[PDB]
Nucleic acid binder design. Sequence first.
RNA 1: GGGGGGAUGUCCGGGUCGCCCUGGGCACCUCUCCCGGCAGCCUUCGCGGGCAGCCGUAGUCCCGGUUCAUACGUCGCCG
Lengths: 51, 99, 108, 113, 125, 125, 359, 543
Amino acid sequence: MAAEVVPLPQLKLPSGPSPITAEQRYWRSFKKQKSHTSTANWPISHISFPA
Amino acid sequence: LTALRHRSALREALQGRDELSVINILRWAGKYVADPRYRSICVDVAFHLIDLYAEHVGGSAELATQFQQLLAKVNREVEKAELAIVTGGMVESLMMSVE
Amino acid sequence: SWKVSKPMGGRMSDIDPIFSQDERHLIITYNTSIQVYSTEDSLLVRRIALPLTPSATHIVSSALSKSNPDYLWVACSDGRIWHINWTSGEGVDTPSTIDTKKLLDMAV
Amino acid sequence: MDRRTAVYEPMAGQSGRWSKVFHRRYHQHDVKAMASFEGKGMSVVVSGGSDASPIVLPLRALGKEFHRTLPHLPQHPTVLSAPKARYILSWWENEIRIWHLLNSAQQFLPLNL
Amino acid sequence: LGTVLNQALRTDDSDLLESCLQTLIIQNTINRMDSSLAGTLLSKLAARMHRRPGRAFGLMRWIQWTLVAHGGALVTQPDLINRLTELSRVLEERSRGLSSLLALKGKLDMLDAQLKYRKALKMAG
Amino acid sequence: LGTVLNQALRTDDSDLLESCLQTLIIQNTINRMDSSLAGTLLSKLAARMHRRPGRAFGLMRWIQWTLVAHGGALVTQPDLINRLTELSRVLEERSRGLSSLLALKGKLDMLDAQLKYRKALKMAG
Amino acid sequence: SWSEWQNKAMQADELLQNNDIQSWEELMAEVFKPEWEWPSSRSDYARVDRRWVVYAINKVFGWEGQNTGRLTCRLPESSVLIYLVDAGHLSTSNVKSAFKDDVREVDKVEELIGEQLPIILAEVDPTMELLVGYLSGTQLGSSELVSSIKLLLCSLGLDEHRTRGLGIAFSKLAACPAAETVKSLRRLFKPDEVLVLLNVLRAELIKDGWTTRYLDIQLIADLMSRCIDAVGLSGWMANFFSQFQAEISVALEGVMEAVRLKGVIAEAANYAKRARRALADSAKGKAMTVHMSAELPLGLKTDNKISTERVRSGGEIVARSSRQIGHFISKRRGIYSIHRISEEMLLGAAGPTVVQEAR
Amino acid sequence: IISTFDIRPIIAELQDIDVAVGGARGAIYVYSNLLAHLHTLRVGTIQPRKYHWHRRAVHSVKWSGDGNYLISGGYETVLVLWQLDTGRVDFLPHLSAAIENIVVSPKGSAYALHLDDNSAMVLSTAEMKPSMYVSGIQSLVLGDRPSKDALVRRVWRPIDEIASPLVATISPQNPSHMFLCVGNGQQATVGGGATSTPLVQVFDISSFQGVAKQAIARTNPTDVNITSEGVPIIEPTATKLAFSHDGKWLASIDEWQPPERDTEAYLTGSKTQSDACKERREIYLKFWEVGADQSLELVTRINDAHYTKQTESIFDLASDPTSARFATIGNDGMVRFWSPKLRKRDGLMATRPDGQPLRSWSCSRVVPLPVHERQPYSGAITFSEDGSILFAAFGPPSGALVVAIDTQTGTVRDVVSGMFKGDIRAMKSLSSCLIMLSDDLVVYDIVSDEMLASYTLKETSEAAKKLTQLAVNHQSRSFALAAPIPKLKRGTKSELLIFNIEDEEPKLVKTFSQVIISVCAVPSSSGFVVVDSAAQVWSITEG
RNA sequence: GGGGGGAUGUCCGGGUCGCCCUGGGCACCUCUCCCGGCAGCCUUCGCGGGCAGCCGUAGUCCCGGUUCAUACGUCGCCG
């Protein structure tokens, strides 16, 4: 049963009482940014989409 | 590093170093003495460095700076170690008033 | 009222765990235990215990018989020799004393 | 080139299967050349390398007799001095170097050497 | 900056917190702040503490003055010892190396000295 | 004060030692002092250390600078490790209480705070 | 042996109802192995059995069932009692086993025991040397301890046993843990009594002299800390406390610099020791490198003598050669030196005198 | 020195032989043409070929198959195939322990490996998957043949020694299965002087065969066994280990430290090397969920389960027989109660890909313990049989004391002292009585508040004191002890004693041919099972 | 290391003044036995025991100033 060569795994260091959870990772993962400006800097009333 | 302490070899890994290498290792250890997640290994390898290369510091002043700069950060690390336990009592000692 | 099971298990000795003829059986020597496994299933077919009872006596040497197969010679620290036949348990109760000072090694 | 010497004898029996009886690390740097000689009660091989040290090996007494390192230094001593002038000197390829000692020993009988 | 802290804490801002924490008036703000927001402040400051261990010099003085002013505010809403729980866990972290950190300090304040001294030889020579 | 120390140490004075030790120039004197007298100085300063444990603030800085300047002078005359022996024995003494002295420190820096704080209520009230 | 001891207990009950305390006390002396001479030894007492201890303490002490009873001395003048003092059986578990019946309904039992008992010992012994003996011998809880040191404050706030008892109680309450101490103090103390002992412990620190100058700890640490917290905020409704923490800061910083110099001198001392060794072998002629000048070499390294043994592959050990030793000696020779040979060495008598350059 | 040898014949006659010797120096010499070197006063030169691989002791060199190949098995866990026609060497490198014995099959087709940790696997040649496996109890053994490598005075010298009971348990919800701590192998474990058992095998009692294997501490089977100085590397060892009440959780705890012969440069003042490694210990508590295929999966490591200004060495752990609750006592003075909650940061539930939530344990309750010091303690703990109350022998030398604490609340119910003549060793609970061993042995009932049984043991050495141990059955209310009979060596006899609760008489007296290492209790049935150092096991049962 | 001795070189009272000595300082060589490790041989199954043992320090004819290290099985892209 020739036990396979594995590299030494890295650690799991102890994590303090504020890690970025999976969800906060998700909403950071909405990654790419683009700032389309309106006509003449009108404030933007309302956006939406169908279903 | 923690494996190279698990197996006792950190001596042998360290002893074959030259000046520039020693400087880089020194600046690293100085960079990470602060984080208590691994201060144990930081201070141990610094111990081996001092034990193993403190002879030629009269020859080379540049590492003497980093030697000082090593000392220099640590000088500010006992204070953080104390200033914690200064407040360290405070937080524990409110806990005995609440009952 | 209470009762003690017979000692079982065992440490494999450092003596050659002999193959059989036709390779189908592996015959191993534990201390106080000689047992034969079938190779294919990796499974016991016989466990032949060997009662030792003299503080530290140990199984010294053992081998198949080179004249006829299916025979095992085994000899302890003191000179007590068994000539058993595997597939079977015939010969456990019938050793033979060699009258040594101290029995150190043997082969057939 | 791995500063190593190895030693070969036939595997007896079937034909020409040679064998590596053993090896050793002899020199300090690698063994650049070696040549054999055997006769008049003498059976040696000389390995001269880059570490400037010719070593003689006993050819027919190998594993049975100690090797010998020669000195790398020339047999003529190549050092001279003017004791009246207290001037020590030596030479190689084209440069002749001279030092002065300027002082006794009993005067020092540390920081001033 | 008291209302600034109040706003920033209750809205759970990041960079407003950074702006007011870059910098007496500190004490005045901690006098004039609130209670429940101060506990949440405590929580995220132990968070910053755990995240980068660089400067203690302002922020410890900060939490000092929190326990000064609204120390008993955690006595008032004492279900959040679980906030207070990790600080114990947090401040026991920074005590770790101190169990032998001085054993560094001296041999280094040793080589300090002659390096000061052979330097103090140097302009003299 | 270098010759003053030299004289006082080799004559084993008491009050001359007191006069020069009541008080930079300190460093200059330790540059310009001797070796064997400095070891004897070390001995009686560990003596004063053991006799009254009141101020450390000058005299530690003193022996600091001794080991600065003529540190290797004890390397030069290294039969007097028995002088150096007791200092170990002396400085292990003042480490004693530190094994739990901080356990005092916090609960006392605790009652510090509200006493500062209820005082910091007091002119406000 | 149970029947035997039960009959012995019956006989001692008979001695009690005959009120034959002297013969009964002699029976106790025989069990413990009137004159009643003592061994001058708290530790060297012979071992006895818990059954006789528990019967003894049941005989000696009393209880009052009114939903909260009270231990009382049934025999206040008893060498058997003072033997229980010096032999340290006076434990809450002992007296609990003694009064398992009447107290099985009572609660807070350790607290009432530890607040009742040392007061009873105190009124028994106003000279309280029995009190300091009980303190020194018995395993003590914090309730007993706070009530005892309270008794000492009443005694003070021929004159040395009391101070001795202060120090011993201080050490023991130092050994105690935080929460139990603090809650007991807050139960049984009043803030002014706490102020008194603050002055006591302040006086102890400044009397040890941590501020009163040179040419002019941990125990009390855990104590003083735990007590002032044990009072806590509701009690203190100034300058005293500020000057207090002033000298406290002086104290701790003296400690800090003390740690600094302990470090540097332990370095220097070990270096000095290895240096003395090195100069010894250099004078012997083992021809290592020693430092000459009045200044510390930066690398405090004392080049050790060569061990006569070597660690080959794989993990084995053999002897060094003379030859390889001479090889390492050649290594340790510096760049330049003088090697004076004497006529006695030429005669085969003495050894050489060598001076190497300062490397 | 000749560690072993194997012959090969040269052929209806025998024309010559070539015989191979293997030596603990780390060498393998082969002799080539023996019969005609020796048959013919004077003979010619002879000279073995030297084939050198291992650093440690070759355990067994055998000629191969044809006689083309020379195979070898060593300490360093690696079976070498010397090519012998070229110069080359091709080899099977990773075995679980020392290769202790090999033999070559009748045809060249199979190898047999007696792996030094008491197993055997049959290989086919050049396919190198083990076609056959048989393992043993893997425990620590007073081995009869002393060593192969201890012939030449190695730096750390091998001594066949035992320094601890063999840490083990029986599984509720599978009484045929026993878990027990093990190292790489016996010899590699005991080497380095200290115990190095970072491993578990699970073993069957009914059919004494191996079942399975897994790791606990960090293991590097893929690695050099030896640090370059020449020393076997110590590997973290789990002191205590116990099973959950339902059969679902498994808490190990491991301690490790550097070696004193490494530390060597951490000495500052009075710092000594024992002091320094004692400072730099690591103590991990490892929480395990049980896979019913006899697998172990982590849920939670705790890095500093008992903290004071240094990490506190942990004395013992215990399992609430009623509910999933584990219990710890250590060097700080505090007992910690651990309970499984759910990893749920702010209401959302973190789940494994199937959707199953990552449960995690946590210190549910924290209790300090009353200390009573007259003028280096220890600890032992046990639940009641009915649970709800935990009994803690806290252990300063002879003055020490037990405390009983409720579980629903952290208040101390009871405290009892004076019940130990020395350093406490261990303590268990029957239905009413606490059995405890220090130097003395005492059954004490608490509801009666009365000592029932008292036995002084005959004076032995400290190793024997360390090796005694006890266990109770919980089905039939009966307990038992185990002790060697008086430096420890090979032939050492032990006695065990079966004691019922209500009487003083030992219900079964029996010594054994060797020193019994460990006693465990079947939960389902009555009786005990004992493990004995000469690595054999047997059960004991009433009726 | 200790306990001790014999001998080397040394100052301070010194002594008729010399051999040195006592009183203080001593560092060394030599002898002594108890410390630590090593090895052999007889003993006994083992445990142990006995026997005469070396070494704890330095420089060689040459010269151990050596010997010695962990497989293949399959690579790459992106998620």
